Amino acid sequence: KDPNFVHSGHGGAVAGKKNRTWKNLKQILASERALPWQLNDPNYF
DNA sequence: CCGGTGCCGAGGCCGCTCAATTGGTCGTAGACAGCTCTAGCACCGCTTAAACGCACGTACGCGCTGTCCCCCGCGTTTTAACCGCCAAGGGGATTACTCCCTAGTCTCCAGGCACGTGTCAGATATATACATCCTGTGCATGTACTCGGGATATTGAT
């Protein structure tokens, strides 16, 4: 009745006390900024 | 007899003449600016961990909201003790002067307790299992408020 019954978490807050859904968008962009983007490389910034 | 007129007396003007006030200049000395480490030390950067702060429903009373009845407020009257003004007697706080004396300066001396560090140990935070004292609920009854009538003051007018 469902595609899968063995669905696994992708970094939720079941263990810790962080946000249950996912990281905040500001945090997502802050983490993505750490990538060694090239000088002419496109990004979300 | 009354009235013009000189003489004297007083009021008005103006002006110094002099004695008391207050901003400006000279001057020197202890104390606000300002490095100089230092110094160790709080403050900042960088991590997580836990909980309290926050938001969503949801139950459930305590504030707003509508109707009759008198008790207190409003408004009038007269009148009287008080407020406000005035005036005089006299005491005492004021003002000024000389004389005395202890505050103020600074100097010297020195021993008592502020003040910091170093050591160590027992009083106190903290977690967990135990349990019983205080609290919401329910309910009998009696101390106290109320109404009514008779004492004892308690004021005012002859």
GROMACS .gro file of C-alpha atoms (C1' of nucleotides) in nm:
model
  203
    1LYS     CA    1   0.000   0.000   0.000
    2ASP     CA    2   0.309   0.218   0.036
    3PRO     CA    3   0.627   0.238  -0.176
    4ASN     CA    4   0.851   0.156   0.121
    5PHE     CA    5   0.815   0.074   0.491
    6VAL     CA    6   1.186   0.112   0.575
    7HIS     CA    7   1.205   0.491   0.542
    8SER     CA    8   1.519   0.625   0.710
    9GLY     CA    9   1.593   0.967   0.853
   10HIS     CA   10   1.808   1.214   0.660
   11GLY     CA   11   1.941   1.405   0.961
   12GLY     CA   12   1.636   1.477   1.174
   13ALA     CA   13   1.609   1.572   1.540
   14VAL     CA   14   1.503   1.232   1.676
   15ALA     CA   15   1.830   1.196   1.867
   16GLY     CA   16   1.920   1.559   1.941
   17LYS     CA   17   1.716   1.865   2.034
   18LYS     CA   18   1.751   2.052   1.704
   19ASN     CA   19   1.478   2.139   1.453
   20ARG     CA   20   1.268   1.832   1.377
   21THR     CA   21   1.211   1.917   1.011
   22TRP     CA   22   1.555   2.021   0.883
   23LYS     CA   23   1.820   2.291   0.914
   24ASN     CA   24   1.709   2.650   0.864
   25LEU     CA   25   1.752   2.809   0.522
   26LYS     CA   26   1.994   3.063   0.669
   27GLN     CA   27   2.194   2.776   0.819
   28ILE     CA   28   2.177   2.590   0.487
   29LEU     CA   29   2.325   2.885   0.299
   30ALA     CA   30   2.583   2.944   0.573
   31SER     CA   31   2.699   2.583   0.538
   32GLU     CA   32   2.695   2.601   0.157
   33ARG     CA   33   2.914   2.913   0.167
   34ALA     CA   34   3.196   2.696   0.307
   35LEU     CA   35   3.228   2.518  -0.029
   36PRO     CA   36   3.543   2.621  -0.224
   37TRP     CA   37   3.347   2.797  -0.497
   38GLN     CA   38   3.558   2.916  -0.788
   39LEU     CA   39   3.589   3.288  -0.859
   40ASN     CA   40   3.360   3.262  -1.163
   41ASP     CA   41   3.154   2.971  -1.029
   42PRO     CA   42   2.779   3.036  -1.002
   43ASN     CA   43   2.603   2.991  -0.669
   44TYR     CA   44   2.293   3.097  -0.476
   45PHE     CA   45   2.467   3.414  -0.350
   46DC     C1'   46  -1.264  15.091   5.824
   47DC     C1'   47  -1.003  14.759   5.397
   48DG     C1'   48  -0.638  14.683   5.078
   49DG     C1'   49  -0.160  14.732   4.833
   50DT     C1'   50   0.302  14.593   4.934
   51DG     C1'   51   0.755  14.482   5.162
   52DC     C1'   52   0.966  14.122   5.454
   53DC     C1'   53   1.030  13.667   5.593
   54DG     C1'   54   0.941  13.187   5.584
   55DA     C1'   55   0.900  12.762   5.324
   56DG     C1'   56   0.895  12.456   4.904
   57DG     C1'   57   1.094  12.337   4.472
   58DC     C1'   58   1.463  12.275   4.153
   59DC     C1'   59   1.930  12.154   4.014
   60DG     C1'   60   2.391  12.000   4.104
   61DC     C1'   61   2.812  11.801   4.296
   62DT     C1'   62   3.102  11.540   4.704
   63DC     C1'   63   3.180  11.165   4.920
   64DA     C1'   64   3.139  10.690   5.068
   65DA     C1'   65   3.031  10.194   4.929
   66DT     C1'   66   3.013   9.812   4.534
   67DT     C1'   67   3.200   9.457   4.141
   68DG     C1'   68   3.469   9.279   3.712
   69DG     C1'   69   3.966   9.268   3.550
   70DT     C1'   70   4.470   9.147   3.602
   71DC     C1'   71   4.876   8.929   3.823
   72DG     C1'   72   5.082   8.490   3.986
   73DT     C1'   73   5.209   8.041   4.142
   74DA     C1'   74   5.117   7.555   4.270
   75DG     C1'   75   4.901   7.126   4.342
   76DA     C1'   76   4.607   6.839   4.039
   77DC     C1'   77   4.356   6.698   3.563
   78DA     C1'   78   4.545   6.483   3.079
   79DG     C1'   79   4.831   6.138   2.933
   80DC     C1'   80   5.193   5.761   2.796
   81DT     C1'   81   5.409   5.292   2.993
   82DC     C1'   82   5.407   4.905   3.059
   83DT     C1'   83   5.181   4.505   3.279
   84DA     C1'   84   4.911   4.189   3.438
   85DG     C1'   85   4.675   3.900   3.472
   86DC     C1'   86   4.225   3.871   3.339
   87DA     C1'   87   3.795   3.947   3.220
   88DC     C1'   88   3.601   3.944   2.745
   89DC     C1'   89   3.551   3.725   2.314
   90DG     C1'   90   3.525   3.305   1.976
   91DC     C1'   91   3.409   2.865   1.941
   92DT     C1'   92   3.160   2.417   2.066
   93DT     C1'   93   2.759   2.141   2.275
   94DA     C1'   94   2.368   2.023   2.625
   95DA     C1'   95   1.954   2.073   2.838
   96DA     C1'   96   1.526   2.343   2.968
   97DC     C1'   97   1.251   2.690   2.979
   98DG     C1'   98   1.015   2.987   2.698
   99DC     C1'   99   0.663   2.989   2.363
  100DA     C1'  100   0.242   2.868   2.096
  101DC     C1'  101  -0.229   2.571   2.026
  102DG     C1'  102  -0.615   2.406   2.180
  103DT     C1'  103  -0.962   2.369   2.537
  104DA     C1'  104  -1.214   2.357   2.980
  105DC     C1'  105  -1.450   2.689   3.298
  106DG     C1'  106  -1.553   3.071   3.596
  107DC     C1'  107  -1.564   3.587   3.686
  108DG     C1'  108  -1.653   4.024   3.466
  109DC     C1'  109  -2.031   4.312   3.167
  110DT     C1'  110  -2.485   4.321   3.070
  111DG     C1'  111  -3.030   4.421   3.180
  112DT     C1'  112  -3.470   4.549   3.564
  113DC     C1'  113  -3.753   4.786   4.068
  114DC     C1'  114  -3.702   5.109   4.522
  115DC     C1'  115  -3.605   5.405   4.845
  116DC     C1'  116  -3.173   5.657   5.077
  117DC     C1'  117  -2.868   5.986   5.009
  118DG     C1'  118  -2.767   6.406   4.753
  119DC     C1'  119  -2.943   6.872   4.609
  120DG     C1'  120  -3.126   7.311   4.722
  121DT     C1'  121  -3.331   7.636   5.017
  122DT     C1'  122  -3.368   7.913   5.446
  123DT     C1'  123  -3.175   8.187   5.866
  124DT     C1'  124  -2.816   8.325   6.170
  125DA     C1'  125  -2.355   8.333   6.440
  126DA     C1'  126  -1.916   8.232   6.564
  127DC     C1'  127  -1.514   8.296   6.302
  128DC     C1'  128  -1.202   8.523   5.971
  129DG     C1'  129  -0.962   8.925   5.866
  130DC     C1'  130  -0.823   9.382   5.948
  131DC     C1'  131  -0.642   9.739   6.254
  132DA     C1'  132  -0.382   9.930   6.642
  133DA     C1'  133  -0.083   9.976   7.046
  134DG     C1'  134   0.252   9.800   7.430
  135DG     C1'  135   0.697   9.593   7.494
  136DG     C1'  136   1.025   9.245   7.491
  137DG     C1'  137   1.419   9.035   7.240
  138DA     C1'  138   1.658   8.925   6.875
  139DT     C1'  139   1.973   9.221   6.602
  140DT     C1'  140   2.399   9.463   6.518
  141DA     C1'  141   2.834   9.618   6.640
  142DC     C1'  142   3.248   9.623   6.933
  143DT     C1'  143   3.658   9.418   7.229
  144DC     C1'  144   3.866   9.008   7.414
  145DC     C1'  145   3.968   8.526   7.460
  146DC     C1'  146   4.060   8.044   7.262
  147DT     C1'  147   4.048   7.668   7.043
  148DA     C1'  148   4.019   7.530   6.510
  149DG     C1'  149   4.362   7.482   6.165
  150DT     C1'  150   4.825   7.393   5.981
  151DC     C1'  151   5.223   7.060   5.965
  152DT     C1'  152   5.536   6.811   6.178
  153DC     C1'  153   5.694   6.401   6.402
  154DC     C1'  154   5.623   5.941   6.581
  155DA     C1'  155   5.459   5.444   6.600
  156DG     C1'  156   5.214   5.069   6.696
  157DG     C1'  157   4.714   4.854   6.573
  158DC     C1'  158   4.451   4.645   6.246
  159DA     C1'  159   4.304   4.659   5.711
  160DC     C1'  160   4.442   4.334   5.365
  161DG     C1'  161   4.615   3.985   5.093
  162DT     C1'  162   4.771   3.482   5.034
  163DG     C1'  163   4.813   2.972   5.149
  164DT     C1'  164   4.611   2.549   5.359
  165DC     C1'  165   4.262   2.214   5.425
  166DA     C1'  166   3.805   2.021   5.587
  167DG     C1'  167   3.332   2.014   5.675
  168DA     C1'  168   2.915   2.233   5.557
  169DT     C1'  169   2.613   2.236   5.149
  170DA     C1'  170   2.439   2.135   4.658
  171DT     C1'  171   2.240   1.726   4.441
  172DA     C1'  172   2.002   1.274   4.310
  173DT     C1'  173   1.666   0.912   4.457
  174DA     C1'  174   1.334   0.651   4.720
  175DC     C1'  175   1.006   0.718   5.100
  176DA     C1'  176   0.578   0.911   5.317
  177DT     C1'  177   0.278   1.225   5.550
  178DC     C1'  178   0.137   1.714   5.617
  179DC     C1'  179  -0.114   2.055   5.406
  180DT     C1'  180  -0.502   2.161   5.084
  181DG     C1'  181  -0.956   2.154   4.810
  182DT     C1'  182  -1.422   1.989   4.920
  183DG     C1'  183  -1.820   1.930   5.191
  184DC     C1'  184  -2.121   2.044   5.577
  185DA     C1'  185  -2.320   2.139   6.093
  186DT     C1'  186  -2.419   2.537   6.383
  187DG     C1'  187  -2.344   2.978   6.643
  188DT     C1'  188  -2.139   3.426   6.692
  189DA     C1'  189  -2.273   3.826   6.522
  190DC     C1'  190  -2.567   4.176   6.238
  191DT     C1'  191  -3.035   4.363   6.260
  192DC     C1'  192  -3.486   4.539   6.443
  193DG     C1'  193  -3.752   4.722   6.830
  194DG     C1'  194  -3.829   4.924   7.278
  195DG     C1'  195  -3.682   5.110   7.727
  196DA     C1'  196  -3.260   5.315   8.035
  197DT     C1'  197  -2.905   5.715   8.071
  198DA     C1'  198  -2.695   6.085   7.936
  199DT     C1'  199  -2.639   6.536   7.656
  200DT     C1'  200  -2.724   6.964   7.489
  201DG     C1'  201  -2.981   7.446   7.452
  202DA     C1'  202  -3.320   7.831   7.632
  203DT     C1'  203  -3.524   8.075   8.038
   0.00000   0.00000   0.00000
